Amino acid sequence: RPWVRGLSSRISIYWTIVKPGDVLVINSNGNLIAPRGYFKMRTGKSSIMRSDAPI
Amino acid sequence: GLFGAIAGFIENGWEGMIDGWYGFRHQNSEGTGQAADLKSTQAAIDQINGKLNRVIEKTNEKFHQIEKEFSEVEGRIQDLEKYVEDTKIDLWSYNAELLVALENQHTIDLTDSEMNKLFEKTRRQLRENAEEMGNGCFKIYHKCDNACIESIRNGTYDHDVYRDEALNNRFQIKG
Ligand SMILES: *[C@@H]1O[C@H](CO)[C@@H](O[C@@H]2O[C@H](CO)[C@@H](O[C@@H]3O[C@H](CO)[C@@H](O)[C@H](O)[C@@H]3O)[C@H](O)[C@H]2NC(C)=O)[C@H](O)[C@H]1NC(C)=O
Ligand SMILES: *[C@H]1O[C@H](CO)[C@@H](O)[C@H](O)[C@H]1NC(C)=O
Incomplete structure:
Protein backbone atom coordinates (compact mmCIF):
# COMPACT_ATOMS: atom_id res chain seq x y z
CA ARG A 1 0.00 0.00 0.00
CA PRO A 2 1.20 3.61 -0.22
CA TRP A 3 4.01 4.00 2.27
CA VAL A 4 2.74 5.88 5.30
CA ARG A 5 5.05 6.60 8.19
CA GLY A 6 7.30 4.05 6.57
CA LEU A 7 4.78 1.21 6.54
CA SER A 8 2.81 -0.14 3.59
CA SER A 9 0.61 -2.42 5.68
CA ARG A 10 -2.50 -1.34 7.60
CA ILE A 11 -4.90 -1.86 10.47
CA SER A 12 -8.66 -1.80 9.83
CA ILE A 13 -10.72 -0.64 12.81
CA TYR A 14 -14.06 -2.14 13.90
CA TRP A 15 -16.49 -1.80 16.82
CA THR A 16 -19.00 -3.96 18.67
CA ILE A 17 -21.56 -2.69 21.16
CA VAL A 18 -22.53 -5.21 23.78
CA LYS A 19 -25.89 -4.72 25.48
CA PRO A 20 -26.32 -5.52 29.18
CA GLY A 21 -26.94 -9.21 29.76
CA ASP A 22 -25.13 -10.01 26.52
CA VAL A 23 -21.62 -11.34 26.13
CA LEU A 24 -18.70 -10.65 23.82
CA VAL A 25 -16.61 -13.43 22.27
CA ILE A 26 -13.51 -12.83 20.17
CA ASN A 27 -12.09 -15.74 18.16
CA SER A 28 -9.10 -15.42 15.90
CA ASN A 29 -6.25 -17.49 14.58
CA GLY A 30 -4.26 -14.51 13.46
CA ASN A 31 -4.18 -10.80 12.63
CA LEU A 32 -6.22 -9.52 15.61
CA ILE A 33 -5.56 -6.11 17.14
CA ALA A 34 -7.28 -6.92 20.45
CA PRO A 35 -9.39 -4.57 22.54
CA ARG A 36 -8.41 -3.66 26.10
CA GLY A 37 -11.74 -2.79 27.58
CA TYR A 38 -14.85 -0.94 26.69
CA PHE A 39 -15.79 2.69 26.44
CA LYS A 40 -18.99 3.53 28.35
CA MET A 41 -21.86 4.81 26.23
CA ARG A 42 -24.17 7.72 27.08
CA THR A 43 -27.06 9.33 25.24
CA GLY A 44 -27.08 13.05 25.76
CA LYS A 45 -26.93 16.36 24.00
CA SER A 46 -23.45 15.81 22.58
CA SER A 47 -21.99 16.02 19.09
CA ILE A 48 -18.90 17.06 17.12
CA MET A 49 -18.23 20.06 14.84
CA ARG A 50 -15.56 20.64 12.18
CA SER A 51 -14.30 24.19 12.86
CA ASP A 52 -11.23 26.40 12.74
CA ALA A 53 -12.80 29.12 14.88
CA PRO A 54 -10.84 30.33 17.96
CA ILE A 55 -12.62 29.39 21.14
CA GLY B 1 -54.29 49.76 3.59
CA LEU B 2 -57.65 48.09 3.75
CA PHE B 3 -59.02 51.04 5.67
CA GLY B 4 -58.18 53.90 3.43
CA ALA B 5 -57.17 56.23 6.27
CA ILE B 6 -53.34 56.23 6.33
CA ALA B 7 -52.06 56.85 2.75
CA GLY B 8 -55.66 57.46 1.75
CA PHE B 9 -58.05 60.08 3.07
CA ILE B 10 -55.33 61.30 5.45
CA GLU B 11 -52.93 63.04 3.07
CA ASN B 12 -49.59 62.55 4.79
CA GLY B 13 -48.15 62.13 8.27
CA TRP B 14 -46.67 64.32 11.00
CA GLU B 15 -42.92 64.03 11.59
CA GLY B 16 -43.73 66.70 14.17
CA MET B 17 -45.81 64.40 16.34
CA ILE B 18 -43.11 62.71 18.35
CA ASP B 19 -45.07 61.87 21.55
CA GLY B 20 -47.47 59.43 19.91
CA TRP B 21 -48.45 57.61 16.73
CA TYR B 22 -51.84 59.08 16.38
CA GLY B 23 -53.18 62.36 17.64
CA PHE B 24 -54.85 65.65 16.88
CA ARG B 25 -54.08 69.10 15.51
CA HIS B 26 -56.47 71.98 15.78
CA GLN B 27 -57.17 75.64 15.12
CA ASN B 28 -59.67 77.67 17.03
CA SER B 29 -60.27 81.38 17.61
CA GLU B 30 -57.16 81.82 19.82
CA GLY B 31 -54.74 79.59 17.95
CA THR B 32 -53.42 76.22 16.93
CA GLY B 33 -52.20 73.23 18.91
CA GLN B 34 -51.41 69.50 18.72
CA ALA B 35 -51.46 66.42 20.96
CA ALA B 36 -50.96 62.62 20.66
CA ASP B 37 -53.67 60.09 21.47
CA LEU B 38 -52.35 57.46 23.88
CA LYS B 39 -55.07 54.82 23.54
CA SER B 40 -54.85 54.20 19.78
CA THR B 41 -51.11 54.54 20.06
CA GLN B 42 -50.97 51.77 22.65
CA ALA B 43 -53.38 49.51 20.70
CA ALA B 44 -51.02 49.66 17.73
CA ILE B 45 -47.92 49.27 19.82
CA ASP B 46 -49.46 46.45 21.84
CA GLN B 47 -50.59 44.40 18.77
CA ILE B 48 -47.28 44.81 17.01
CA ASN B 49 -45.44 43.86 20.22
CA GLY B 50 -47.61 40.75 20.60
CA LYS B 51 -46.87 39.81 17.02
CA LEU B 52 -43.18 40.57 17.64
CA ASN B 53 -43.11 38.17 20.62
CA ARG B 54 -44.58 35.20 18.76
CA VAL B 55 -41.82 35.57 16.15
CA ILE B 56 -38.83 36.66 18.25
CA GLU B 57 -36.78 34.51 20.64
CA LYS B 58 -38.51 31.12 20.16
CA THR B 59 -35.61 28.98 18.94
CA ASN B 60 -35.64 25.19 18.95
CA GLU B 61 -32.68 23.37 20.40
CA LYS B 62 -31.01 20.72 18.29
CA PHE B 63 -27.80 18.85 19.09
CA HIS B 64 -26.38 15.94 17.06
CA GLN B 105 -49.51 43.21 5.16
CA HIS B 106 -51.19 42.64 8.46
CA THR B 107 -49.30 45.31 10.44
CA ILE B 108 -50.04 47.88 7.73
CA ASP B 109 -53.78 47.09 7.51
CA LEU B 110 -53.91 46.99 11.30
CA THR B 111 -52.31 50.38 11.94
CA ASP B 112 -54.58 51.71 9.14
CA SER B 113 -57.51 50.41 11.12
CA GLU B 114 -56.41 52.12 14.34
CA MET B 115 -56.17 55.49 12.63
CA ASN B 116 -59.64 55.14 11.20
CA LYS B 117 -60.97 53.87 14.53
CA LEU B 118 -59.84 57.07 16.20
CA PHE B 119 -61.49 58.99 13.42
CA GLU B 120 -64.82 57.22 13.92
CA LYS B 121 -64.53 57.60 17.73
CA THR B 122 -64.14 61.34 17.28
CA ARG B 123 -66.77 61.56 14.51
CA ARG B 124 -69.28 59.92 16.86
CA GLN B 125 -68.44 62.24 19.80
CA LEU B 126 -68.99 65.33 17.70
CA ARG B 127 -72.62 64.38 16.83
CA GLU B 128 -74.34 67.23 14.94
CA ASN B 129 -71.77 69.75 16.05
CA ALA B 130 -69.32 69.06 13.28
CA GLU B 131 -69.01 68.19 9.63
CA GLU B 132 -66.25 66.22 7.94
CA MET B 133 -63.98 67.91 5.49
CA GLY B 134 -62.66 64.60 4.22
CA ASN B 135 -58.92 65.11 4.72
CA GLY B 136 -59.08 63.79 8.24
CA CYS B 137 -60.51 67.05 9.61
CA PHE B 138 -63.83 67.89 11.23
CA LYS B 139 -65.07 71.42 10.95
CA ILE B 140 -66.50 72.17 14.40
CA TYR B 141 -69.39 74.58 13.88
CA HIS B 142 -69.16 76.36 17.21
CA LYS B 143 -66.56 78.08 19.33
CA CYS B 144 -64.19 75.51 20.78
CA ASP B 145 -61.29 76.86 22.86
CA ASN B 146 -58.33 74.66 23.76
CA ALA B 147 -60.24 73.27 26.78
CA CYS B 148 -63.09 72.41 24.53
CA ILE B 149 -60.67 70.77 22.07
CA GLU B 150 -59.19 68.82 24.97
CA SER B 151 -62.56 67.52 26.17
CA ILE B 152 -62.86 65.92 22.75
CA ARG B 153 -59.31 64.57 22.89
CA ASN B 154 -60.09 62.91 26.23
CA GLY B 155 -63.60 61.86 25.32
CA THR B 156 -65.55 63.99 27.79
CA TYR B 157 -66.97 66.35 25.17
CA ASP B 158 -70.72 66.84 25.82
CA HIS B 159 -72.41 67.61 22.56
CA ASP B 160 -75.73 68.70 24.11
CA VAL B 161 -73.93 71.69 25.64
CA TYR B 162 -73.00 73.00 22.17
CA ARG B 163 -75.85 71.68 20.05
CA ASP B 164 -77.95 74.78 19.38
CA GLU B 165 -74.87 76.80 18.61
CA ALA B 166 -73.50 74.20 16.22
CA LEU B 167 -76.80 73.50 14.44
CA ASN B 168 -77.36 77.19 13.91
CA ASN B 169 -74.06 77.73 12.07
CA ARG B 170 -74.30 74.49 10.13
CA PHE B 171 -77.64 75.71 8.94
CA GLN B 172 -77.42 79.53 8.76
CA ILE B 173 -79.71 81.62 6.61
CA LYS B 174 -78.81 84.00 3.78
CA GLY B 175 -80.18 86.93 5.74
C1 LIG C 1 4.82 -1.92 -4.55
O1 LIG C 1 4.84 -0.67 -5.17
C2 LIG C 1 4.87 0.41 -4.28
C3 LIG C 1 4.85 1.63 -5.08
O2 LIG C 1 5.81 1.41 -6.07
C4 LIG C 1 6.08 0.35 -3.47
O3 LIG C 1 6.05 1.50 -2.55
C5 LIG C 1 7.25 2.23 -2.34
O4 LIG C 1 8.04 1.62 -1.33
C6 LIG C 1 9.29 2.22 -1.25
C7 LIG C 1 10.17 1.41 -0.42
O5 LIG C 1 11.42 1.68 -1.01
C8 LIG C 1 9.12 3.60 -0.76
O6 LIG C 1 10.38 4.19 -0.62
C9 LIG C 1 10.54 5.16 0.39
O7 LIG C 1 10.22 6.46 -0.09
C10 LIG C 1 10.11 7.47 0.91
C11 LIG C 1 9.62 8.75 0.22
O8 LIG C 1 10.26 8.86 -1.04
C12 LIG C 1 11.47 7.69 1.58
O9 LIG C 1 11.26 8.22 2.90
C13 LIG C 1 12.28 6.34 1.73
O10 LIG C 1 13.63 6.80 1.63
C14 LIG C 1 12.00 5.16 0.71
O11 LIG C 1 12.73 5.27 -0.49
C15 LIG C 1 8.31 4.35 -1.77
O12 LIG C 1 8.16 5.69 -1.38
C16 LIG C 1 6.97 3.65 -1.94
N1 LIG C 1 6.15 4.32 -2.92
C17 LIG C 1 4.85 4.31 -2.64
C18 LIG C 1 3.84 4.95 -3.53
O13 LIG C 1 4.38 3.77 -1.65
C19 LIG C 1 6.16 -1.05 -2.83
O14 LIG C 1 7.38 -1.32 -2.26
C20 LIG C 1 6.13 -2.05 -3.90
N2 LIG C 1 6.41 -3.38 -3.43
C21 LIG C 1 7.02 -4.16 -4.33
C22 LIG C 1 7.34 -5.59 -3.90
O15 LIG C 1 7.31 -3.76 -5.46
C1 LIG D 1 -58.73 63.88 30.79
O1 LIG D 1 -58.22 62.65 30.11
C2 LIG D 1 -57.24 61.69 30.79
C3 LIG D 1 -57.99 60.49 31.36
O2 LIG D 1 -57.07 59.63 32.09
C4 LIG D 1 -56.46 62.43 31.93
O3 LIG D 1 -55.32 61.66 32.41
C5 LIG D 1 -56.06 63.79 31.29
O4 LIG D 1 -54.85 64.37 31.87
C6 LIG D 1 -57.41 64.58 31.30
N1 LIG D 1 -56.92 65.77 30.67
C7 LIG D 1 -56.37 66.69 31.46
C8 LIG D 1 -55.81 68.00 30.82
O5 LIG D 1 -56.27 66.53 32.68
Whole structure:
Protein backbone atom coordinates (compact mmCIF):
# COMPACT_ATOMS: atom_id res chain seq x y z
CA ARG A 1 0.00 0.00 0.00
CA PRO A 2 1.20 3.61 -0.22
CA TRP A 3 4.01 4.00 2.27
CA VAL A 4 2.74 5.88 5.30
CA ARG A 5 5.05 6.60 8.19
CA GLY A 6 7.30 4.05 6.57
CA LEU A 7 4.78 1.21 6.54
CA SER A 8 2.81 -0.14 3.59
CA SER A 9 0.61 -2.42 5.68
CA ARG A 10 -2.50 -1.34 7.60
CA ILE A 11 -4.90 -1.86 10.47
CA SER A 12 -8.66 -1.80 9.83
CA ILE A 13 -10.72 -0.64 12.81
CA TYR A 14 -14.06 -2.14 13.90
CA TRP A 15 -16.49 -1.80 16.82
CA THR A 16 -19.00 -3.96 18.67
CA ILE A 17 -21.56 -2.69 21.16
CA VAL A 18 -22.53 -5.21 23.78
CA LYS A 19 -25.89 -4.72 25.48
CA PRO A 20 -26.32 -5.52 29.18
CA GLY A 21 -26.94 -9.21 29.76
CA ASP A 22 -25.13 -10.01 26.52
CA VAL A 23 -21.62 -11.34 26.13
CA LEU A 24 -18.70 -10.65 23.82
CA VAL A 25 -16.61 -13.43 22.27
CA ILE A 26 -13.51 -12.83 20.17
CA ASN A 27 -12.09 -15.74 18.16
CA SER A 28 -9.10 -15.42 15.90
CA ASN A 29 -6.25 -17.49 14.58
CA GLY A 30 -4.26 -14.51 13.46
CA ASN A 31 -4.18 -10.80 12.63
CA LEU A 32 -6.22 -9.52 15.61
CA ILE A 33 -5.56 -6.11 17.14
CA ALA A 34 -7.28 -6.92 20.45
CA PRO A 35 -9.39 -4.57 22.54
CA ARG A 36 -8.41 -3.66 26.10
CA GLY A 37 -11.74 -2.79 27.58
CA TYR A 38 -14.85 -0.94 26.69
CA PHE A 39 -15.79 2.69 26.44
CA LYS A 40 -18.99 3.53 28.35
CA MET A 41 -21.86 4.81 26.23
CA ARG A 42 -24.17 7.72 27.08
CA THR A 43 -27.06 9.33 25.24
CA GLY A 44 -27.08 13.05 25.76
CA LYS A 45 -26.93 16.36 24.00
CA SER A 46 -23.45 15.81 22.58
CA SER A 47 -21.99 16.02 19.09
CA ILE A 48 -18.90 17.06 17.12
CA MET A 49 -18.23 20.06 14.84
CA ARG A 50 -15.56 20.64 12.18
CA SER A 51 -14.30 24.19 12.86
CA ASP A 52 -11.23 26.40 12.74
CA ALA A 53 -12.80 29.12 14.88
CA PRO A 54 -10.84 30.33 17.96
CA ILE A 55 -12.62 29.39 21.14
CA GLY B 1 -54.29 49.76 3.59
CA LEU B 2 -57.65 48.09 3.75
CA PHE B 3 -59.02 51.04 5.67
CA GLY B 4 -58.18 53.90 3.43
CA ALA B 5 -57.17 56.23 6.27
CA ILE B 6 -53.34 56.23 6.33
CA ALA B 7 -52.06 56.85 2.75
CA GLY B 8 -55.66 57.46 1.75
CA PHE B 9 -58.05 60.08 3.07
CA ILE B 10 -55.33 61.30 5.45
CA GLU B 11 -52.93 63.04 3.07
CA ASN B 12 -49.59 62.55 4.79
CA GLY B 13 -48.15 62.13 8.27
CA TRP B 14 -46.67 64.32 11.00
CA GLU B 15 -42.92 64.03 11.59
CA GLY B 16 -43.73 66.70 14.17
CA MET B 17 -45.81 64.40 16.34
CA ILE B 18 -43.11 62.71 18.35
CA ASP B 19 -45.07 61.87 21.55
CA GLY B 20 -47.47 59.43 19.91
CA TRP B 21 -48.45 57.61 16.73
CA TYR B 22 -51.84 59.08 16.38
CA GLY B 23 -53.18 62.36 17.64
CA PHE B 24 -54.85 65.65 16.88
CA ARG B 25 -54.08 69.10 15.51
CA HIS B 26 -56.47 71.98 15.78
CA GLN B 27 -57.17 75.64 15.12
CA ASN B 28 -59.67 77.67 17.03
CA SER B 29 -60.27 81.38 17.61
CA GLU B 30 -57.16 81.82 19.82
CA GLY B 31 -54.74 79.59 17.95
CA THR B 32 -53.42 76.22 16.93
CA GLY B 33 -52.20 73.23 18.91
CA GLN B 34 -51.41 69.50 18.72
CA ALA B 35 -51.46 66.42 20.96
CA ALA B 36 -50.96 62.62 20.66
CA ASP B 37 -53.67 60.09 21.47
CA LEU B 38 -52.35 57.46 23.88
CA LYS B 39 -55.07 54.82 23.54
CA SER B 40 -54.85 54.20 19.78
CA THR B 41 -51.11 54.54 20.06
CA GLN B 42 -50.97 51.77 22.65
CA ALA B 43 -53.38 49.51 20.70
CA ALA B 44 -51.02 49.66 17.73
CA ILE B 45 -47.92 49.27 19.82
CA ASP B 46 -49.46 46.45 21.84
CA GLN B 47 -50.59 44.40 18.77
CA ILE B 48 -47.28 44.81 17.01
CA ASN B 49 -45.44 43.86 20.22
CA GLY B 50 -47.61 40.75 20.60
CA LYS B 51 -46.87 39.81 17.02
CA LEU B 52 -43.18 40.57 17.64
CA ASN B 53 -43.11 38.17 20.62
CA ARG B 54 -44.58 35.20 18.76
CA VAL B 55 -41.82 35.57 16.15
CA ILE B 56 -38.83 36.66 18.25
CA GLU B 57 -36.78 34.51 20.64
CA LYS B 58 -38.51 31.12 20.16
CA THR B 59 -35.61 28.98 18.94
CA ASN B 60 -35.64 25.19 18.95
CA GLU B 61 -32.68 23.37 20.40
CA LYS B 62 -31.01 20.72 18.29
CA PHE B 63 -27.80 18.85 19.09
CA HIS B 64 -26.38 15.94 17.06
CA GLN B 65 -27.90 15.89 13.57
CA ILE B 66 -26.54 14.73 10.20
CA GLU B 67 -23.41 15.88 8.48
CA LYS B 68 -23.78 18.58 5.87
CA GLU B 69 -20.37 19.11 4.29
CA PHE B 70 -18.29 16.45 2.65
CA SER B 71 -14.62 15.81 1.90
CA GLU B 72 -15.02 13.03 -0.69
CA VAL B 73 -17.48 12.09 -3.42
CA GLU B 74 -19.58 9.18 -2.22
CA GLY B 75 -22.76 8.77 -4.10
CA ARG B 76 -26.16 7.49 -3.09
CA ILE B 77 -26.14 8.40 0.64
CA GLN B 78 -24.39 11.76 0.48
CA ASP B 79 -26.83 12.65 -2.37
CA LEU B 80 -29.68 11.79 -0.10
CA GLU B 81 -27.97 13.53 2.91
CA LYS B 82 -27.61 16.64 0.80
CA TYR B 83 -31.14 16.41 -0.65
CA VAL B 84 -32.69 16.12 2.85
CA GLU B 85 -30.92 19.24 4.10
CA ASP B 86 -31.44 21.23 0.91
CA THR B 87 -35.11 20.35 0.93
CA LYS B 88 -35.30 21.46 4.55
CA ILE B 89 -33.69 24.81 3.97
CA ASP B 90 -35.99 25.71 1.04
CA LEU B 91 -39.17 24.85 2.96
CA TRP B 92 -37.86 26.95 5.89
CA SER B 93 -36.92 29.78 3.51
CA TYR B 94 -40.47 29.64 2.11
CA ASN B 95 -41.70 29.80 5.68
CA ALA B 96 -39.70 32.94 6.49
CA GLU B 97 -40.49 34.80 3.33
CA LEU B 98 -44.27 34.17 3.63
CA LEU B 99 -44.39 35.09 7.32
CA VAL B 100 -42.82 38.49 6.78
CA ALA B 101 -45.11 39.11 3.82
CA LEU B 102 -48.31 38.15 5.69
CA GLU B 103 -47.07 39.80 8.90
CA ASN B 104 -46.27 43.08 7.13
CA GLN B 105 -49.51 43.21 5.16
CA HIS B 106 -51.19 42.64 8.46
CA THR B 107 -49.30 45.31 10.44
CA ILE B 108 -50.04 47.88 7.73
CA ASP B 109 -53.78 47.09 7.51
CA LEU B 110 -53.91 46.99 11.30
CA THR B 111 -52.31 50.38 11.94
CA ASP B 112 -54.58 51.71 9.14
CA SER B 113 -57.51 50.41 11.12
CA GLU B 114 -56.41 52.12 14.34
CA MET B 115 -56.17 55.49 12.63
CA ASN B 116 -59.64 55.14 11.20
CA LYS B 117 -60.97 53.87 14.53
CA LEU B 118 -59.84 57.07 16.20
CA PHE B 119 -61.49 58.99 13.42
CA GLU B 120 -64.82 57.22 13.92
CA LYS B 121 -64.53 57.60 17.73
CA THR B 122 -64.14 61.34 17.28
CA ARG B 123 -66.77 61.56 14.51
CA ARG B 124 -69.28 59.92 16.86
CA GLN B 125 -68.44 62.24 19.80
CA LEU B 126 -68.99 65.33 17.70
CA ARG B 127 -72.62 64.38 16.83
CA GLU B 128 -74.34 67.23 14.94
CA ASN B 129 -71.77 69.75 16.05
CA ALA B 130 -69.32 69.06 13.28
CA GLU B 131 -69.01 68.19 9.63
CA GLU B 132 -66.25 66.22 7.94
CA MET B 133 -63.98 67.91 5.49
CA GLY B 134 -62.66 64.60 4.22
CA ASN B 135 -58.92 65.11 4.72
CA GLY B 136 -59.08 63.79 8.24
CA CYS B 137 -60.51 67.05 9.61
CA PHE B 138 -63.83 67.89 11.23
CA LYS B 139 -65.07 71.42 10.95
CA ILE B 140 -66.50 72.17 14.40
CA TYR B 141 -69.39 74.58 13.88
CA HIS B 142 -69.16 76.36 17.21
CA LYS B 143 -66.56 78.08 19.33
CA CYS B 144 -64.19 75.51 20.78
CA ASP B 145 -61.29 76.86 22.86
CA ASN B 146 -58.33 74.66 23.76
CA ALA B 147 -60.24 73.27 26.78
CA CYS B 148 -63.09 72.41 24.53
CA ILE B 149 -60.67 70.77 22.07
CA GLU B 150 -59.19 68.82 24.97
CA SER B 151 -62.56 67.52 26.17
CA ILE B 152 -62.86 65.92 22.75
CA ARG B 153 -59.31 64.57 22.89
CA ASN B 154 -60.09 62.91 26.23
CA GLY B 155 -63.60 61.86 25.32
CA THR B 156 -65.55 63.99 27.79
CA TYR B 157 -66.97 66.35 25.17
CA ASP B 158 -70.72 66.84 25.82
CA HIS B 159 -72.41 67.61 22.56
CA ASP B 160 -75.73 68.70 24.11
CA VAL B 161 -73.93 71.69 25.64
CA TYR B 162 -73.00 73.00 22.17
CA ARG B 163 -75.85 71.68 20.05
CA ASP B 164 -77.95 74.78 19.38
CA GLU B 165 -74.87 76.80 18.61
CA ALA B 166 -73.50 74.20 16.22
CA LEU B 167 -76.80 73.50 14.44
CA ASN B 168 -77.36 77.19 13.91
CA ASN B 169 -74.06 77.73 12.07
CA ARG B 170 -74.30 74.49 10.13
CA PHE B 171 -77.64 75.71 8.94
CA GLN B 172 -77.42 79.53 8.76
CA ILE B 173 -79.71 81.62 6.61
CA LYS B 174 -78.81 84.00 3.78
CA GLY B 175 -80.18 86.93 5.74
C1 LIG C 1 4.82 -1.92 -4.55
O1 LIG C 1 4.84 -0.67 -5.17
C2 LIG C 1 4.87 0.41 -4.28
C3 LIG C 1 4.85 1.63 -5.08
O2 LIG C 1 5.81 1.41 -6.07
C4 LIG C 1 6.08 0.35 -3.47
O3 LIG C 1 6.05 1.50 -2.55
C5 LIG C 1 7.25 2.23 -2.34
O4 LIG C 1 8.04 1.62 -1.33
C6 LIG C 1 9.29 2.22 -1.25
C7 LIG C 1 10.17 1.41 -0.42
O5 LIG C 1 11.42 1.68 -1.01
C8 LIG C 1 9.12 3.60 -0.76
O6 LIG C 1 10.38 4.19 -0.62
C9 LIG C 1 10.54 5.16 0.39
O7 LIG C 1 10.22 6.46 -0.09
C10 LIG C 1 10.11 7.47 0.91
C11 LIG C 1 9.62 8.75 0.22
O8 LIG C 1 10.26 8.86 -1.04
C12 LIG C 1 11.47 7.69 1.58
O9 LIG C 1 11.26 8.22 2.90
C13 LIG C 1 12.28 6.34 1.73
O10 LIG C 1 13.63 6.80 1.63
C14 LIG C 1 12.00 5.16 0.71
O11 LIG C 1 12.73 5.27 -0.49
C15 LIG C 1 8.31 4.35 -1.77
O12 LIG C 1 8.16 5.69 -1.38
C16 LIG C 1 6.97 3.65 -1.94
N1 LIG C 1 6.15 4.32 -2.92
C17 LIG C 1 4.85 4.31 -2.64
C18 LIG C 1 3.84 4.95 -3.53
O13 LIG C 1 4.38 3.77 -1.65
C19 LIG C 1 6.16 -1.05 -2.83
O14 LIG C 1 7.38 -1.32 -2.26
C20 LIG C 1 6.13 -2.05 -3.90
N2 LIG C 1 6.41 -3.38 -3.43
C21 LIG C 1 7.02 -4.16 -4.33
C22 LIG C 1 7.34 -5.59 -3.90
O15 LIG C 1 7.31 -3.76 -5.46
C1 LIG D 1 -58.73 63.88 30.79
O1 LIG D 1 -58.22 62.65 30.11
C2 LIG D 1 -57.24 61.69 30.79
C3 LIG D 1 -57.99 60.49 31.36
O2 LIG D 1 -57.07 59.63 32.09
C4 LIG D 1 -56.46 62.43 31.93
O3 LIG D 1 -55.32 61.66 32.41
C5 LIG D 1 -56.06 63.79 31.29
O4 LIG D 1 -54.85 64.37 31.87
C6 LIG D 1 -57.41 64.58 31.30
N1 LIG D 1 -56.92 65.77 30.67
C7 LIG D 1 -56.37 66.69 31.46
C8 LIG D 1 -55.81 68.00 30.82
O5 LIG D 1 -56.27 66.53 32.68
